[model samples]
Target: AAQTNAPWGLARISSTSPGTSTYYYDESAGQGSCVYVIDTGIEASHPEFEGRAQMVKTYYYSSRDGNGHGTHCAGTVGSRTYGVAKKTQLFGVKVLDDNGSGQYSTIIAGMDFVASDKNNRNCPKGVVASLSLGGGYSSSVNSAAARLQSSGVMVAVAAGNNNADARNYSPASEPSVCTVGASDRYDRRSSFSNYGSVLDIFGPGTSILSTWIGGSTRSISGTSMATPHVAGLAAYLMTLGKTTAASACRYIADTANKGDLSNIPFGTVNLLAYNNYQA
Candidate 1:
């Protein structure tokens, strides 16, 4: 009989997408996990979230979700329509302001708060920090990723959309980060996606449709859009027993689909395949 492809491929999402991977491994729709979206912040009142999105703290702006980037990323991580992980506690940490920018110091501080969340009140294991912001190279952000990851908090970062080497960016440049690049719905590397060893994985980012500000939804593009997909998957993995960064990165790398790419140093990545290593 001719080999038939599964219905799940584009980012490992299927009608049964909530539970398993493309390999068909049972990931369980990312329950028992906490995902911290660090960006412009999210609208906690959105109906898609159904009260799951929790706004824990805000730094600079009156509220962090003044910009749409954070909300969109948040939706991709946990919202009902676009999220990879259907069940997760989402905590919004506003590092960037309404202008969609902030200081590296502010980001580091936000990370610290999540790390010492001692009671695990945010998540059963720990928090997965989903970052969509960058500002060249900042040792502070790198240090934050390392420290938080060591403390049981997995930090998933964006491999900047500069169309250049991901090593040139701040958190992406950092070795501790699970840096993610951008891929389109057709399973190809995005033109603006940064690549190289610093780029750990790729996710659906090109023209991605997700939750937006004012309790609406929209489509946007960027590596920033891709990072949350990895974050949500990481949460799913944590529920499957890979809690720390090293194990999660290894499992993702070892079990990836190794899809082709014209760009990036490795020429291929694990490309978010939850439905590949199957039953």
Candidate 2:
């Protein structure tokens, strides 16, 4: 039962000529062979997600659909039509409940599920894990996330959306995890996005349209939406033989549009050039 506001044309952006499909074609072209979406369950029936939305495992450690945050974020990264990684398999791990809150232990447990499944016949051997959620920054959480990265799992997390200094925790501030910031459709860093050198990259986040609960669609804004864009890109790079997360990140950083941070404490992120780097 989420509220809505006349269904802004933002959702229509995904349907326009140069929609996400165009982005995929201009760049990835469905090269993500196997990628895992470690988030709340996705709406498997969204028309934009016809044959996509493969749920490897689902856990509701938190509530169901009260907040609808996870659903929106999942849609941005994995929804068939609106998503960046349209061809990748989406594995949903419900670490956060419907209330949109979860303990650090719960998040770690979700990571363990994907790590252990590396060898499962049903799972991909070398897979990337997209984590579009994070709380305060903590050394302990960084250690845990680093351990997963060390295990050869590509971990991507959202730099908190607080717009505060880079002192936030868990995944974003973690050195081992790739932290993503938000940018608008114009490719400029969103004023609401948190920023710092820890910010690894940027992606489309402003007015992003994605699946909501109960087979609906809506537009939301947050660094959470931006994270999956990078995750999807990483999956696409893997398809091109950019295996490790570091390599994929390097490619992005090397090709991203340089920005100026003279006035702003943290630098700005350029989204359009970021996606243009894809081969």
Candidate 3:
């Protein structure tokens, strides 16, 4: 069967609608909202994310680009026009640094930086933290996510790209974290997307268009891309009074397009139907 367009493609659909505003406006203006994207440092000068992204903080624990995976992931989540949360504040926590790898302890420090006031005066108060990276599920990471949630911060994590029944660890596998899976445009699960009962929702993960380092553009695929789509949507919903993570999740699940999921392995996850749900 031919692949269907994913929610990321929904932006194009919404854009062409006669009376519909942009995807960012569909939820709320997202003004005065903050989203700390904990990933590799974004191309600080990417045109799409130029004035839109506010680098509240950055912490580098590595010194190599490896294969530029982190940069690509960063672009997908918070890279200005390339990302859904264009206007939201972005805290670039470079836990993996240039090598695209980091210790669990480094990731923990990055999370701490998300809530650190010393980093930015307008740091994440009740905002969401978008973590597109993950390791195996671990007790320490789960504990940190729980603490963040208790402190009024929402955490969104990629369920990993392992294509396994169990989810990746630390943040994504944590009960308190919003574990996201990846689906293609046709509502089909990405072949590599990990799935299980622990999965929360699915987002676009195939042929995703995003920013690249040095002010370039590229198309990559991964649950990493899907993770930020949900994160940005959460930020958008928050601007519309969907204050808590649960409330925001409900709105997305309720407003998402449901029919698209039918053909996909994890087709149960849809955004159109969820977006239309009433309280």
Candidate 4:
């Protein structure tokens, strides 16, 4: 958790009214989609969640979120008020500890946990894994991402917040996953975001308001927040009966608002989901 502010990511992506709450996710949001948040943990019972959030497991740590990072990201993914896919079921898989840090192996374990239907009761086919963390490269992680993809899961990863090229990062550089970068409300790349050829897309991350631990809310930044927006948007797309990963990826990638950022080397812009997302 970082600061205190009302949520606004959905508002930014709206094509009609940028400041209207009516444009936010309503009855049709994420009707059949499920999101797995692989982070610190979540205050799953937060009243703001409106009963859709679920706490599945805390892999390395105790079943608690000492650090609020996970909950924050989870809120941005699907909390009733702050989320993109507001109606989607949310499951938490804690890999990072209280300090918002974790061993690479633990992260991999968390990914595998979310992917396994036997381990996770709520786990279903075509789940979306919202990973808001990444750094160095790992062949193990690369393989894990591939396996999850083979299982029909859409892995939305963060292109680290190092202000460098994303090609040096592990999951971000991995071609199999949908690696995301961070952008500000003005649709410009966040100063700390890693960009370049490896970034698959971008999303609002700076000063993003989201759910916090202990049934509260807060504001934070990073490619972490950005990753969920993309993941939730994809999950929202899944609710429209997109059972295949390729269909969902193509539609989301193609239907974006094209932020038209300054000096962007990549083809896509911020992950702006407009156009009603329906035929």
Candidate 5:
């Protein structure tokens, strides 16, 4: 017996050929990069992590994902089996609480920690931050993310799930971050994914399955799920010498599968994130 296929989302991004069930990745995929999951936290003990996920910082009392959002996002980024960048290390910077809610101040603190950590000696060659949360426009939140990006850390954010213009959201509206929208397996825009020019690209978001809390797995949908797919792609790109945040962001957008998505709203980028792994 042989495992000859991958998850639809993973299989879709690795190859440009349509209807391919296989996933192609480099032997050194994301080997020297680190991704920070700034969300509700992560269950580091989950089997999917294979000891690669850990909590680096926490605004909550402890470093555990009671909400499961962070663990799912982290799995999409670098879980052993379900990851986009299988070798990338996962660091949890828990800004949101158990219920998947957080204040702007705490979010800022989490980004602050990431920025500082990036400058430390223990940091890897490439760094990416996956933010799967957003809210109404906030100047401070946008500025914090912008500052984090300016410091050479690739920041990938969700375009929001409001089904409205993403420009009204804070970090999603932030031009400095790589904002991502949601697309289905059929390459159509998800009805609930926010649109508009604020988005940088689209990722498979509908019915996404990944690591959950309590060492299980679950399938869910949202721009939150779409975000880490791009985040993982960014990490993979960084490992291939697109080391700077700007270069990684540019490469992800420029090399993306362009004009492939259907039912895209006006002013939205019709690019779908691709791993560019040709086998």
Candidate 6:
């Protein structure tokens, strides 16, 4: 069903049946939309970005992604070749440190910044933010994420790589955010991906190839990787006029490929992310 070589994530989302080999997308995919990646940092110089990705804010000392997680996630969100939303503008809001660790304060600060930035702009088409990290439940983080969603930014959060119930996590458990689990190419839940009633949908996370720290590419896996796929998909959907955070969240879940994924936990929804492609 695919037209050419493409990432499994892209190809999978486009085709109706599983085991696809290539990708397809709309001509206006991700046009006139923006995504803020709240993680470590992004290597904006990566050729995959084609000068579109940049570090907009940093709670750390530098804007460069020494850990590589953020860059990889950013590439998944909007890079030219591996992106889910190929044309969405990307900005990195560094909340995690180079070691891929941060406290609640730093994380909430990044959320606050996104809220302020969204409020300060005239982006009526709406914006998206991807959060690829989580920890034990925290009201502070939940409140911040809910506030960010209320601020008109469609928030996509990882269900975590803990292989446990996502209800035990912070932002992932937040009702206002779009909590995502990881699905492999075979349309099964990734072993390391968290699951629960809290999860809104699933996306490709196993061995995902994307831009890294040295302007190179690497294949890695995590719910961290999966969350951005939804984030990028949300960007593309927003361009299609799902302008509100709730609407974008609903579209991603409602338009998903239902009851297709295998190995889903008892409480987890069997919705796999789709790029609004009917085929």
Model 4 collision count: 0
Which candidate comes out best when scored by lDDT? 6
The parts of candidate 3 lying over 4 Å away from their true place are 1-24, 56-71, 78-80, 123-126, 262-279
Error of 5 at 141 (Å): 0.5
- Per-candidate TM-scores read 0.86, 0.80, 0.80, 0.88, 0.96, 0.96
Clashes of each: 11, 6, 32, 0, 0, 0
Candidates' C-alpha lDDT: 0.73, 0.62, 0.62, 0.75, 0.87, 0.88
* Residue-by-residue lDDT tens digits, candidate 3, 56-151: 554553332334555565555555455564456655566776656778897887787676642354633247777888888788877877776656
Give the TM-score (vs. native) of candidate 3: 0.80
Worst 10 residues of 2 by lDDT: 1-10
Error of 6 at 63 (Å): 1.2
Q: What is the lDDT of residue 200 in candidate 1?
A: 76
lDDT of 5 by residue, 147-220 (tens): 98988889999999999998899899999889999998888899899999889989989988899998999899
- Give, for candidate 3, the lowest lDDT window spanning 10 residues: 12-21
- Identify the runs in model 1 with alpha carbons over 4 angstroms from their true place: 1-27, 118-122, 242-246, 265-279
lDDT of 2: 0.62
Check candidate 6 and list the clashing pairs. Answer: none
For candidate 4, lDDT tens digit of each residue in 90-209? Answer: 888888888988888888877777778524454343478888888788888877876776677888889899988887887888887888888776667788888877777777788898
lDDT of 2 by residue, 158-227 (tens): 8777877654656888876777877665445677777777777766667877788888887888888877
lDDT of 6 by residue, 34-141 (tens): 899999999998888988887889987788899999999999999988898888889899999999999999999999999998665445566999999999999899
Misplaced by over 4 Å in model 4 are 1-6, 16-22, 118-125, 266-279
Instruction: Give the runs in model 5 whose Cα sits over 4 Å from its true position.
Output: 1-3
